[PDB]
Each structure stands twice: as structure tokens, then as C-alpha cells.
């Protein structure tokens, strides 16, 4: 109900400039402080700064590591939060989260967006090739079958994988991308009942925000 959605993440070169957004709803925006927090892959959370509420003049505070480099502003009519990043560097590559914050004086509930991923490098944006993984012509093994999808050769991260638009979640393993040169490759497996496949449709849906691409690949027996 209370939703925080970040966008604007993606690829950018060193020295470059990027602006992130965080659209909201479900609560009266003007009454809350808003925070930005980031997290480099496999590292610790890191507070970047916040923007105060109306009753406190929408003023700002930042952490040293972003001093005079990052700027926080807010569109009070649109209920959107922004984070202006300038003169970017490798260490800035991370997932960026916005969060509803406050004077810790009011009895509140916390909310965070899913975050947007910023990658800093000079590599090029590349859409993935999505391939279906069906069992060999060989014989099966039990009343359950494992199917899969090889999401190969894209840049940068991330890529989101679902099966049958998310209706097939239980029994799904999506493996972390592996970097080989300037390209990422990942896979995802789903195990379902033999009575389900090929009897019914099983499709992996892959999305690549950086390239604005979406691929839906049906797994059909060889």
C-alpha cells in the first residue's frame, strides 16, 4: 500500500552524472524525512543522507563519503524523491535504496523500496540471449522434471527472471550472474511435476532494464 519505487539506475561511465528517483504513495509524503542508502554487491549498507519533512524545512544532511558530490531533493507535488549523483566512481557501483525516515519521535512503521542498481564502468550495454534448457532426448528420472533457462551475454546487471509470470515460484533456483570479460551469464532452474510439463506451458520471462528488453522463452521438449 505504502510503495517506494526507485528507478534511474543502470550504466554510467566514470566522471559521469546520474539522477535516481523514488516515487511514492500510500502516505502523506510531506510529513516524512526521506533517506537514501546504498549497498555495493556483497557489502554493508551505507547511509548517504536525508531530506527533512515540511515541518523541518526540507533541509538536508549527507554522509562524508558523498559530501558535495551527491544532492538530495524532493518534488512535493509529485511525491517523488531524487538523488543527484555527480563525478561518479567505481566504488559508487551499488544498489540504491530510498527509505521513509523520521524524527524517531512518532510511533511509525518503516518502508524501503526494492532498490535500483547503478553500475559504473565503460563497458557497453548488451541485451541477453535467452536459451531454453530442456532435458536431453535421453530417459527421465522420477515423476519430477527440471527445466531451465540460460540468460547469456548481457551487461550490465541486473536481469530479472520469473517463470510463467511469477505463478511458478516454488521450486525455482536462479543462480547469480558470473562476469566473463564485459559480459554476464546466469541460469535459472525450475522443477515441476511430469504431469505438468510438457502437458502445460512453462515459460521463463527475462527482463533487462538497462536495455529495456524483455524475452519470454517457452521450454518445449526436443
Amino acid at each position: 500500500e505504502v510503495k517506494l519505487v526507485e528507478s534511474g539506475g543502470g550504466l554510467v561511465q566514470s566522471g559521469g552524472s546520474l539522477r535516481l528517483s523514488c516515487a511514492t504513495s500510500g502516505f502523506t509524503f510531506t510529513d516524512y524525512y526521506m533517506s537514501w542508502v546504498r549497498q555495493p554487491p556483497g557489502k554493508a549498507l551505507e547511509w548517504l543522507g536525508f531530506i527533512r519533512n515540511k515541518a523541518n524545512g526540507y533541509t538536508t544532511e549527507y554522509s562524508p563519503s558523498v559530501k558535495g558530490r551527491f544532492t538530495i531533493s524532493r518534488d512535493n507535488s509529485q511525491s517523488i524523491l531524487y538523488l543527484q549523483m555527480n563525478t561518479l566512481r567505481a566504488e559508487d557501483s551499488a544498489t540504491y535504496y530510498c527509505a521513509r525516515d523520521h524524527d524517531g519521535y512518532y510511533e511509525r512503521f518503516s518502508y524501503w523500496g526494492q532498490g535500483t542498481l547503478v553500475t559504473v564502468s565503460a563497458a557497453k550495454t548488451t541485451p541477453p540471449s535467452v536459451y531454453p534448457l530442456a532435458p536431453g532426448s535421453a530417459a527421465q528420472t522420477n515423476s519430477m522434471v527440471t527445466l531451465g533457462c540460460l540468460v547469456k551475454g548481457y551487461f550490465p546487471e541486473p536481469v530479472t527472471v520469473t517463470w510463467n509470470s511469477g505463478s511458478l515460484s516454488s521450486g525455482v533456483h536462479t543462480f547469480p550472474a558470473v562476469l566473463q570479460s564485459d559480459l554476464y551469464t546466469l541460469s535459472s532452474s525450475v522443477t515441476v511435476p511430469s504431469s505438468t510439463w510438457p502437458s502445460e506451458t512453462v515459460t521463463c520471462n527475462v527482463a533487462h532494464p538497462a536495455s529495456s528488453t524483455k524475452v519470454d522463452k517457452k521450454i518445449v521438449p526436443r
Binding site: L45, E46, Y131, L133, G136, H173, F175, V178, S187, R222
Partner: protein, 219 residues
């Protein structure tokens, strides 16, 4: 600025056991006026966004299990999980709210469990990938424990290590196992010059490798 130190770096227990983890600030987070310690604890399950569990050091946010309790006052704080459940696999972070905000380095909580053999399955290159001049043979190693495991590819009986990409998943939140993915990549011509393809998995659970394979001309 306030520095937040967390200990230990990681914990590990079987489902049902109890764990505690430390968080210390470079200064007191006790507000003399509100009589509240501005210390909060967060939980971050893999692939997820941080979730507030406790604030003011002792208060549990509505919806949070009683098994999560926070204590401490001044500079030394503790997060206790009474009876660790498998879904608790996560990195826990404390955060001070006294002056501005700052996070600790986090404490990772892993789950110990009984040994489990991997379920292995191999997939030949798809017809689609082949037309693009490439050829990936994929091997999934699902639901095993512990995380230690070796994968050896063989092509026509001979071992191979050139174009192998491996990837391990985080621990599973339901059953506390691990899964892995191995991908042997070749060009279309190589893949078609050979005939037997094998994926071998060696795991503590057996001295005999779990073997999966296929012949390019099977029927």
C-alpha cells in the same frame, strides 16, 4: 561521526538453537530527554531489502516474532534470536539514529543442517544457441549441504577446464541447502566434433561422484 561495530562477522546454528550478536557505538545513543536509545536492528534476507525488526533498542515492530528481542543501553547493544528458524538466514544490521544515521558492518547468520546429496541434471545446448555459433552445456546441482562441492566436466571421457563458469546460490530459506550451476561453453564446431558429455559432482555425501551425462546422438 558515530561508528557502529558489530560482532561477530558471522554466526551459524542448527534450527531451534539460540544466537546473540553484538553492536557497539562510538558514543552513547541514549537521549537524556526521551529516555530512549536510538538503536535499531535490521534483517536482510538474500535478494531482499532490509527490514526493520526492532527500534529504540527494545521495541519490536508490529508483526515481528517474539523470538526476536533486543537489549542494551548506552553504547553496548545485543540482538537475540530465541529459537532460530530456517527462514532467519540473513545479514542483520544495527543502525544508530542518535545523530544522523549510520550502519554497522553487519552480522551474517547461516543455518547448520544435516547432510544432503545434490540432485544433478545436465542439459545439452539448445538448438537456438547453436545457430548463433555457440554451445553451452549446463549442469544444475540442486539442494545439497554443506556448500563444499566439486564439479568436473568431461568430454569424450577426457577432463576439461576451459570455459567453465560456476555459480553458487545463497543458502535456501526453506530447507537450508545450497544449489550450484556449472556451464561448459564451447563453439558450435567443437561441441559437434565430440560425442560424450559428462558432468561429475563430488560431495562429502559420497566417495563415488554423482555422474550425469549424455550422447550427442542419443534417442
Amino acid at each position: 561521526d558515530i561508528v557502529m561495530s558489530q560482532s561477530p562477522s558471522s554466526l551459524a546454528v542448527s534450527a531451534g538453537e539460540k544466537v546473540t550478536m553484538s553492536c557497539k557505538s562510538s558514543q552513547s545513543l541514549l537521549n537524556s530527554r526521551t529516555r530512549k536509545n536510538y538503536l535499531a536492528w535490521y534483517q536482510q534476507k538474500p535478494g531482499q531489502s532490509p527490514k526493520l525488526l526492532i527500534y529504540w533498542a527494545s521495541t519490536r515492530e508490529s508483526g515481528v516474532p517474539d523470538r526476536f528481542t533486543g537489549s542494551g543501553s548506552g553504547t553496548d547493544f545485543t540482538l537475540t534470536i530465541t529459537s532460530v528458524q530456517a527462514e532467519d538466514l540473513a545479514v542483520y544490521y544495527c543502525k544508530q539514529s542518535y545523530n544522523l544515521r549510520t550502519f554497522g558492518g553487519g552480522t551474517k547468520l547461516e543455518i547448520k543442517r544435516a547432510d544432503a546429496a545434490p540432485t544433478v541434471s545436465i542439459f545439452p545446448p539448445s538448438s537456438e544457441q547453436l545457430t548463433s555459433g555457440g554451445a553451452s552445456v549446463v549442469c544444475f546441482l540442486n539442494n545439497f549441504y554443506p556448500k563444499d562441492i566439486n564439479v568436473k566436466w568431461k568430454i569424450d571421457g577426457s577432463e576439461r577446464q576451459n570455459g567453465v563458469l560456476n555459480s553458487w546460490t545463497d543458502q535456501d530459506s526453506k530447507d537450508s541447502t545450497y544449489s550450484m550451476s556449472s556451464t561448459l561453453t564451447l563453439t558450435k564446431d567443437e561441441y559437434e566434433r565430440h560425442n560424450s558429455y559428462t558432468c561429475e559432482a563430488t560431495h562429502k555425501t559420497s566417495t563415488s561422484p554423482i555422474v550425469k551425462s549424455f550422447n550427442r546422438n542419443e534417442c
